[PDB]
CSV table of all heavy atoms in Angstrom, one decimal:
chain,number,residue,atom,x,y,z
S,1,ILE,N,3.1,-72.2,-169.2
S,1,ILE,CA,4.3,-71.3,-169.1
S,1,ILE,C,3.9,-69.9,-168.6
S,1,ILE,O,2.8,-69.4,-169.0
S,1,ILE,CB,5.0,-71.3,-170.4
S,1,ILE,CG1,4.1,-71.0,-171.5
S,1,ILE,CG2,5.6,-72.7,-170.6
S,1,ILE,CD1,4.7,-71.2,-172.9
S,2,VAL,N,4.7,-69.3,-167.8
S,2,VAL,CA,4.4,-68.1,-167.1
S,2,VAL,C,4.5,-66.9,-168.1
S,2,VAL,O,5.5,-66.8,-168.8
S,2,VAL,CB,5.4,-67.9,-165.9
S,2,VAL,CG1,4.9,-68.7,-164.8
S,2,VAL,CG2,6.8,-68.2,-166.3
S,3,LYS,N,3.5,-66.0,-168.1
S,3,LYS,CA,3.5,-64.8,-168.9
S,3,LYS,C,4.0,-63.7,-168.1
S,3,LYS,O,3.3,-63.2,-167.2
S,3,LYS,CB,2.1,-64.6,-169.4
S,3,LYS,CG,1.2,-65.8,-169.6
S,3,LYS,CD,0.1,-65.6,-170.6
S,3,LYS,CE,-0.7,-66.8,-170.8
S,3,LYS,NZ,-1.5,-66.8,-172.1
S,4,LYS,N,5.2,-63.2,-168.3
S,4,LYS,CA,5.8,-62.1,-167.6
S,4,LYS,C,5.3,-60.8,-168.1
S,4,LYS,O,6.0,-59.9,-168.5
S,4,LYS,CB,7.3,-62.2,-167.6
S,4,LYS,CG,8.0,-63.4,-167.0
S,4,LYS,CD,7.4,-63.8,-165.7
S,4,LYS,CE,8.1,-63.2,-164.5
S,4,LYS,NZ,7.7,-63.9,-163.2
S,5,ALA,N,4.0,-60.6,-167.9
S,5,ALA,CA,3.3,-59.4,-168.4
S,5,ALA,C,2.5,-58.7,-167.3
S,5,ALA,O,2.0,-59.4,-166.5
S,5,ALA,CB,2.4,-59.7,-169.6
S,6,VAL,N,2.4,-57.4,-167.4
S,6,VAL,CA,1.6,-56.7,-166.5
S,6,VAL,C,0.2,-56.8,-167.0
S,6,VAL,O,-0.6,-57.7,-166.6
S,6,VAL,CB,1.9,-55.2,-166.4
S,6,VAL,CG1,1.3,-54.5,-165.2
S,6,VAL,CG2,3.4,-55.0,-166.5
S,7,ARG,N,-0.2,-56.0,-168.0
S,7,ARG,CA,-1.5,-55.9,-168.6
S,7,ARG,C,-1.3,-55.1,-169.9
S,7,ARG,O,-0.2,-54.8,-170.3
S,7,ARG,CB,-2.5,-55.2,-167.8
S,7,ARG,CG,-3.2,-55.9,-166.6
S,7,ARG,CD,-2.5,-55.5,-165.3
S,7,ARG,NE,-3.0,-56.2,-164.2
S,7,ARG,CZ,-2.4,-57.3,-163.7
S,7,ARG,NH1,-1.4,-57.8,-164.3
S,7,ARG,NH2,-2.9,-57.9,-162.6
S,8,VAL,N,-2.4,-54.8,-170.6
S,8,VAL,CA,-2.5,-53.7,-171.5
S,8,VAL,C,-3.3,-52.5,-170.8
S,8,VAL,O,-3.0,-51.3,-171.0
S,8,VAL,CB,-3.2,-54.1,-172.8
S,8,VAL,CG1,-3.1,-52.9,-173.8
S,8,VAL,CG2,-2.6,-55.3,-173.4
S,9,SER,N,-4.2,-52.9,-169.9
S,9,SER,CA,-4.9,-51.9,-169.0
S,9,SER,C,-4.5,-52.0,-167.6
S,9,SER,O,-4.7,-53.0,-167.0
S,9,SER,CB,-6.4,-52.0,-169.2
S,9,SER,OG,-6.8,-51.4,-170.4
S,10,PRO,N,-3.9,-50.9,-167.0
S,10,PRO,CA,-3.2,-51.1,-165.7
S,10,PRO,C,-4.0,-51.3,-164.5
S,10,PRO,O,-4.4,-50.4,-163.7
S,10,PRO,CB,-2.4,-49.8,-165.6
S,10,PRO,CG,-3.3,-48.8,-166.3
S,10,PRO,CD,-4.1,-49.5,-167.3
S,11,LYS,N,-4.4,-52.6,-164.2
S,11,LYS,CA,-5.4,-52.9,-163.3
S,11,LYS,C,-5.0,-54.0,-162.4
S,11,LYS,O,-4.5,-55.0,-162.9
S,11,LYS,CB,-6.8,-53.2,-164.0
S,11,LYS,CG,-8.0,-53.1,-163.2
S,11,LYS,CD,-9.2,-53.6,-164.1
S,11,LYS,CE,-9.4,-52.7,-165.3
S,11,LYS,NZ,-10.5,-53.1,-166.2
S,12,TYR,N,-5.3,-54.0,-161.1
S,12,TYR,CA,-5.1,-55.0,-160.1
S,12,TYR,C,-3.7,-55.6,-160.2
S,12,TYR,O,-3.5,-56.6,-160.8
S,12,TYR,CB,-6.2,-56.1,-160.1
S,12,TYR,CG,-6.5,-56.9,-161.4
S,12,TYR,CD1,-6.0,-58.2,-161.5
S,12,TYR,CD2,-7.4,-56.4,-162.3
S,12,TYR,CE1,-6.3,-58.9,-162.7
S,12,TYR,CE2,-7.7,-57.1,-163.5
S,12,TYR,CZ,-7.1,-58.4,-163.6
S,12,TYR,OH,-7.4,-59.1,-164.7
S,13,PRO,N,-2.7,-54.8,-159.6
S,13,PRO,CA,-1.3,-55.1,-160.0
S,13,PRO,C,-0.7,-56.5,-159.5
S,13,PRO,O,-1.4,-57.3,-158.9
S,13,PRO,CB,-0.5,-54.0,-159.3
S,13,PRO,CG,-1.5,-53.0,-158.9
S,13,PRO,CD,-2.8,-53.7,-158.7
S,14,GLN,N,0.6,-56.6,-159.8
S,14,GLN,CA,1.3,-57.9,-159.7
S,14,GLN,C,1.3,-58.5,-158.3
S,14,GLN,O,2.0,-57.9,-157.4
S,14,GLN,CB,2.7,-57.7,-160.3
S,14,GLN,CG,2.7,-56.8,-161.5
S,14,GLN,CD,3.0,-55.4,-161.1
S,14,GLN,OE1,3.0,-55.0,-160.0
S,14,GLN,NE2,3.3,-54.5,-162.2
S,15,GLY,N,0.7,-59.6,-158.1
S,15,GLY,CA,0.7,-60.3,-156.8
S,15,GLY,C,1.7,-61.5,-157.0
S,15,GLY,O,2.9,-61.3,-156.8
S,16,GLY,N,1.2,-62.7,-157.3
S,16,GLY,CA,2.0,-63.8,-157.8
S,16,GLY,C,1.7,-63.9,-159.3
S,16,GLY,O,0.9,-63.3,-159.9
S,17,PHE,N,2.5,-64.8,-159.9
S,17,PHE,CA,2.2,-65.3,-161.3
S,17,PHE,C,1.8,-66.8,-161.2
S,17,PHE,O,2.7,-67.7,-161.0
S,17,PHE,CB,3.4,-65.1,-162.2
S,17,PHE,CG,3.5,-63.7,-162.8
S,17,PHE,CD1,4.5,-63.4,-163.6
S,17,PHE,CD2,2.5,-62.8,-162.7
S,17,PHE,CE1,4.6,-62.2,-164.2
S,17,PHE,CE2,2.5,-61.6,-163.2
S,17,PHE,CZ,3.6,-61.3,-164.0
S,18,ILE,N,0.5,-67.0,-161.5
S,18,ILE,CA,-0.1,-68.3,-161.7
S,18,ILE,C,-0.6,-68.2,-163.1
S,18,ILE,O,-1.7,-68.6,-163.4
S,18,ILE,CB,-1.2,-68.6,-160.6
S,18,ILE,CG1,-0.5,-68.5,-159.2
S,18,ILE,CG2,-1.7,-70.0,-160.6
S,18,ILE,CD1,-1.5,-68.2,-158.1
S,19,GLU,N,0.3,-67.6,-164.0
S,19,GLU,CA,-0.1,-67.2,-165.3
S,19,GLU,C,-0.5,-68.3,-166.2
S,19,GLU,O,-0.1,-69.5,-166.0
S,19,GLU,CB,1.0,-66.3,-165.9
S,19,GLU,CG,1.2,-65.0,-165.2
S,19,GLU,CD,0.0,-64.2,-165.2
S,19,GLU,OE1,-0.7,-64.1,-166.3
S,19,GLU,OE2,-0.4,-63.6,-164.2
S,20,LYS,N,-1.3,-68.0,-167.2
S,20,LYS,CA,-2.1,-68.9,-167.9
S,20,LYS,C,-1.3,-69.8,-168.9
S,20,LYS,O,-0.1,-69.7,-169.0
S,20,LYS,CB,-3.3,-68.2,-168.6
S,20,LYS,CG,-4.6,-69.0,-168.4
S,20,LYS,CD,-5.6,-68.6,-169.5
S,20,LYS,CE,-6.4,-67.4,-169.2
S,20,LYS,NZ,-7.5,-67.1,-170.1
S,21,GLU,N,-2.0,-70.5,-169.7
S,21,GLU,CA,-1.5,-71.6,-170.5
S,21,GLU,C,-1.0,-71.2,-171.9
S,21,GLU,O,-0.8,-70.0,-172.1
S,21,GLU,CB,-2.6,-72.7,-170.7
S,21,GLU,CG,-3.3,-73.1,-169.5
S,21,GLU,CD,-4.6,-72.3,-169.4
S,21,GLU,OE1,-5.0,-71.7,-170.4
S,21,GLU,OE2,-5.3,-72.3,-168.3
S,22,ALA,N,-0.8,-72.1,-172.8
S,22,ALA,CA,-0.1,-71.9,-174.1
S,22,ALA,C,-0.9,-72.8,-175.1
S,22,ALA,O,-1.6,-73.7,-174.7
S,22,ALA,CB,1.3,-72.3,-173.9
S,23,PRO,N,-0.7,-72.5,-176.4
S,23,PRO,CA,-1.6,-73.1,-177.4
S,23,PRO,C,-1.6,-74.6,-177.5
S,23,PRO,O,-2.6,-75.2,-177.7
S,23,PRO,CB,-1.2,-72.4,-178.6
S,23,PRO,CG,-0.9,-71.1,-178.2
S,23,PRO,CD,-0.2,-71.3,-176.9
S,24,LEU,N,-0.4,-75.3,-177.5
S,24,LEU,CA,-0.2,-76.7,-177.6
S,24,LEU,C,-0.8,-77.3,-178.9
S,24,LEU,O,-1.9,-77.8,-179.0
S,24,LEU,CB,-0.8,-77.5,-176.4
S,24,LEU,CG,-0.6,-79.0,-176.3
S,24,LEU,CD1,0.9,-79.3,-176.5
S,24,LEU,CD2,-0.9,-79.4,-174.9
S,25,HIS,N,0.0,-77.1,-180.0
S,25,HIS,CA,-0.2,-77.6,-181.4
S,25,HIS,C,-1.0,-78.9,-181.5
S,25,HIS,O,-0.6,-79.9,-180.9
S,25,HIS,CB,1.1,-77.7,-182.1
S,25,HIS,CG,1.0,-77.9,-183.6
S,25,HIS,ND1,0.8,-79.1,-184.2
S,25,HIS,CD2,1.2,-77.0,-184.6
S,25,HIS,CE1,0.8,-78.9,-185.5
S,25,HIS,NE2,1.0,-77.6,-185.8
S,26,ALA,N,-2.1,-79.0,-182.3
S,26,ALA,CA,-3.1,-79.9,-182.0
S,26,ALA,C,-3.0,-81.2,-182.8
S,26,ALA,O,-4.0,-81.9,-183.1
S,26,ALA,CB,-4.5,-79.3,-182.4
S,27,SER,N,-1.8,-81.6,-183.2
S,27,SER,CA,-1.5,-82.9,-183.8
S,27,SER,C,-1.0,-83.9,-182.7
S,27,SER,O,-0.5,-84.9,-183.1
S,27,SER,CB,-0.6,-82.8,-184.9
S,27,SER,OG,-0.4,-84.1,-185.5
S,28,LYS,N,-1.1,-83.5,-181.4
S,28,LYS,CA,-0.6,-84.4,-180.4
S,28,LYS,C,-1.6,-84.5,-179.2
S,28,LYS,O,-1.2,-84.9,-178.1
S,28,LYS,CB,0.7,-83.8,-179.9
S,28,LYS,CG,0.5,-82.4,-179.3
S,28,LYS,CD,1.8,-81.6,-179.3
S,28,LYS,CE,2.4,-81.6,-180.7
S,28,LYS,NZ,1.5,-81.0,-181.7
S,29,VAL,N,-2.8,-84.0,-179.4
S,29,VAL,CA,-3.9,-84.1,-178.4
S,29,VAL,C,-4.7,-85.3,-178.8
S,29,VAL,O,-5.6,-85.3,-179.6
S,29,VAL,CB,-4.7,-82.8,-178.2
S,29,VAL,CG1,-3.9,-81.9,-177.3
S,29,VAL,CG2,-4.9,-82.2,-179.5
S,30,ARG,N,-4.4,-86.5,-178.3
S,30,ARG,CA,-5.1,-87.7,-178.6
S,30,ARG,C,-6.4,-87.7,-177.8
S,30,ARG,O,-6.4,-87.7,-176.6
S,30,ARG,CB,-4.3,-88.9,-178.2
S,30,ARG,CG,-2.9,-89.0,-178.8
S,30,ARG,CD,-3.0,-89.1,-180.3
S,30,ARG,NE,-3.9,-90.2,-180.7
S,30,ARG,CZ,-3.5,-91.5,-180.8
S,30,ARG,NH1,-2.3,-91.9,-180.5
S,30,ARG,NH2,-4.4,-92.4,-181.2
S,31,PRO,N,-7.5,-87.8,-178.5
S,31,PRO,CA,-8.8,-87.8,-177.7
S,31,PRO,C,-9.0,-89.1,-176.9
S,31,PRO,O,-8.3,-90.0,-177.0
S,31,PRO,CB,-9.9,-87.7,-178.9
S,31,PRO,CG,-9.2,-88.1,-180.1
S,31,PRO,CD,-7.7,-87.8,-179.9
S,32,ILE,N,-10.1,-89.0,-176.2
S,32,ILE,CA,-10.4,-90.1,-175.2
S,32,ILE,C,-11.9,-90.4,-175.2
S,32,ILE,O,-12.7,-89.6,-175.7
S,32,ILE,CB,-10.0,-89.6,-173.8
S,32,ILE,CG1,-9.6,-90.8,-172.9
S,32,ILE,CG2,-11.0,-88.8,-173.0
S,32,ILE,CD1,-8.3,-91.4,-173.4
S,33,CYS,N,-12.2,-91.6,-174.7
S,33,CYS,CA,-13.5,-92.3,-174.6
S,33,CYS,C,-13.1,-93.4,-173.6
S,33,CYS,O,-12.0,-93.4,-173.1
S,33,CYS,CB,-13.9,-92.8,-176.0
S,33,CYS,SG,-14.7,-91.7,-177.1
S,34,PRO,N,-14.0,-94.4,-173.3
S,34,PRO,CA,-13.5,-95.5,-172.5
S,34,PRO,C,-12.5,-96.4,-173.3
S,34,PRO,O,-12.8,-97.5,-173.8
S,34,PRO,CB,-14.8,-96.3,-172.3
S,34,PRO,CG,-15.8,-95.3,-172.2
S,34,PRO,CD,-15.5,-94.2,-173.1
S,35,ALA,N,-11.3,-95.8,-173.4
S,35,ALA,CA,-10.2,-96.2,-174.3
S,35,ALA,C,-9.0,-95.3,-173.9
S,35,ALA,O,-9.1,-94.6,-172.9
S,35,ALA,CB,-10.6,-96.1,-175.8
S,36,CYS,N,-7.9,-95.4,-174.7
S,36,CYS,CA,-6.8,-94.5,-174.6
S,36,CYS,C,-6.4,-94.2,-176.0
S,36,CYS,O,-5.9,-95.1,-176.7
S,36,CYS,CB,-5.7,-94.9,-173.7
S,36,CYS,SG,-6.1,-95.6,-172.1
S,37,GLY,N,-6.4,-92.9,-176.4
S,37,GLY,CA,-6.0,-92.6,-177.8
S,37,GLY,C,-7.1,-93.0,-178.8
S,37,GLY,O,-8.2,-92.5,-178.7
S,38,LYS,N,-6.7,-93.9,-179.7
S,38,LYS,CA,-7.6,-94.5,-180.7
S,38,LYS,C,-8.4,-93.5,-181.6
S,38,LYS,O,-9.4,-93.0,-181.1
S,38,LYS,CB,-8.5,-95.5,-180.0
S,38,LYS,CG,-7.8,-96.8,-179.7
S,38,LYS,CD,-8.7,-97.8,-179.0
S,38,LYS,CE,-7.9,-98.7,-178.1
S,38,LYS,NZ,-7.6,-98.1,-176.8
S,39,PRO,N,-7.8,-93.2,-182.7
S,39,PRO,CA,-8.3,-92.0,-183.5
S,39,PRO,C,-9.8,-92.0,-183.8
S,39,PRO,O,-10.5,-93.0,-183.8
S,39,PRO,CB,-7.6,-92.2,-184.9
S,39,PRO,CG,-6.5,-93.2,-184.6
S,39,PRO,CD,-6.9,-94.0,-183.5
S,40,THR,N,-10.3,-90.8,-184.0
S,40,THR,CA,-11.7,-90.6,-184.3
S,40,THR,C,-12.1,-91.1,-185.6
S,40,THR,O,-11.3,-91.2,-186.6
S,40,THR,CB,-12.1,-89.1,-184.2
S,40,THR,OG1,-11.6,-88.5,-185.4
S,40,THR,CG2,-11.5,-88.5,-183.0
C-alpha cells in the first residue's frame, strides 16, 4: 500500500510513488518447503 508521505528529512523529492510494503499480521503467512503450507 502506498505511503503518501514526503519524508522526515527533506531529501530527493517526490517523483513517483512505488512506496513500500505493510506489516501483514503473521498468523497467515504459511511457510514453505517442497510442499505447500504444512505447519512447522
Side-chain angles (χ1 to χ4, degrees):
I1 54 190
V2 283
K3 329 199 177 202
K4 296 318 268 194
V6 197
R7 284 101 185 92
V8 187
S9 279
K11 200 186 292 181
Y12 58 100
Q14 321 92 349
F17 276 177
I18 300 155
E19 291 301 315
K20 220 204 276 191
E21 314 98 9
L24 190 43
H25 193 277
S27 182
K28 61 203 54 61
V29 280
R30 303 297 307 277
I32 209 71
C33 280
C36 312
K38 281 181 208 82
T40 74

